[PDB]
Symmetry: none
Subunit: 209 residues, 2 copies
């Protein structure tokens, strides 16, 4: 099964609906951690695959890691305000299967953190989720809104709890710790988009920076 894991909270409801819409056709199931909701909103009633849960605490974006998997699931870790392309799962799965010559995970958003040395400051190269990337790269950090991995390779809630504030860092630390590789995959510019209603009287924006 292809399974998507997501978390939101109330003020993001408009963004969430569209993020789910973009995913629904192409995944087998969506786990949704509804942080700080009272009820499951009826805006979500259209989605047969959707599985919403009001958690016992505010996990924020650790929330995507609260859900159990099955042994053979492929997990798509998502964000609540990304418009995923029509061929997101097809493409990413083929990256994952082509690149599985050695035990690794694949992602869009990723960084190359470089430690300070000999007076040189600490450095970070970032390949963001909107940016294109011509050939694949080995990275040492991956954003949890654009990652594709086997249920086997996913860190549990026990591992990720408390990592609100640095979720990508705690995630990548688990990969580095279990020597699982990290691959940023190729994509044309603006393959993924971001939804938004901004400061200017909430104008809806399906193409955010």
């Amino acid at each position: 099964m292809i399974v998507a894991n997501m978390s939101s909270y109330p003020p993001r409801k408009k963004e969430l609906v569209h993020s789910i819409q973009s995913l629904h056709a192409q995944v087998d199931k969506i786990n949704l951690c509804l942080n700080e909701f009272e009820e499951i909103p009826e805006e979500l009633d259209g989605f047969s695959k959707l599985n919403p849960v009001i958690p016992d605490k505010d996990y924020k974006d650790v929330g995507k890691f609260i859900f159990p998997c099955a042994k053979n699931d492929m997990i798509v870790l998502t964000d609540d305000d990304i418009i995923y392309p029509p061929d997101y799962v097809e493409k990413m799965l083929n990256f994952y299967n082509s690149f599985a010559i050695f035990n690794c995970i694949v992602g869009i958003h990723g960084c190359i953190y470089i430690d300070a040395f000999d007076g040189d400051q600490s450095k970070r190269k970032v390949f963001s989720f909107t940016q294109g990337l011509l050939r694949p790269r080995v990275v040492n950090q991956l954003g949890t809104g654009t990652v594709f991995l086997k249920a086997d390779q996913l860190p549990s809630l026990k591992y990720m709890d408390g990592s609100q504030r640095f979720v990508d860092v705690r995630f990548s630390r688990y990969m580095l710790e279990n020597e699982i590789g990290m691959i940023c995959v190729p994509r044309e510019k603006n393959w993924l988009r971001e939804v938004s209603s901004g400061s200017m009287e909430g104008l809806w924006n399906t193409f955010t920076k």
Copy 2:
């Protein structure tokens, strides 16, 4: 005995196109198996076709759906996609190309890829022949799209073999052919010999 069977999968949003595609094959094949993923009942829009064997399956097989059907060993099989209008000479020309290349134990298709590995500091060069392109001379390829293939039943991979391959069907399918020593030929055709289906279209 030797029959031309067309194996197809579809799902509810594609009901309108499915009907257009099936028309384009009906006259040129002897039978059409059709795997109705995510349906609850067989749609009445499908009733007119006397050779259509529509089937709602035990689970959602997606692009693998077309591999559920057991076929008779001696039969010729035509793997198809719900969104292609196949020309009226499709089967007839594909059987010919098939016979030509049978001497090398091959199958034949329209969509296909040549992937070359990165080697000694060379680049991985991939070369697609899309299903609407023309092609003058036949070309040997290492992958074929499963919506535009013609082959013998005893070359068809099984449902056990193909399950798990969803959303990368063509790779699994093409590796079967490599493993069993079947060649894959991307056959010649004129420009726009096949085309994708439309919506609100006075074409034909």
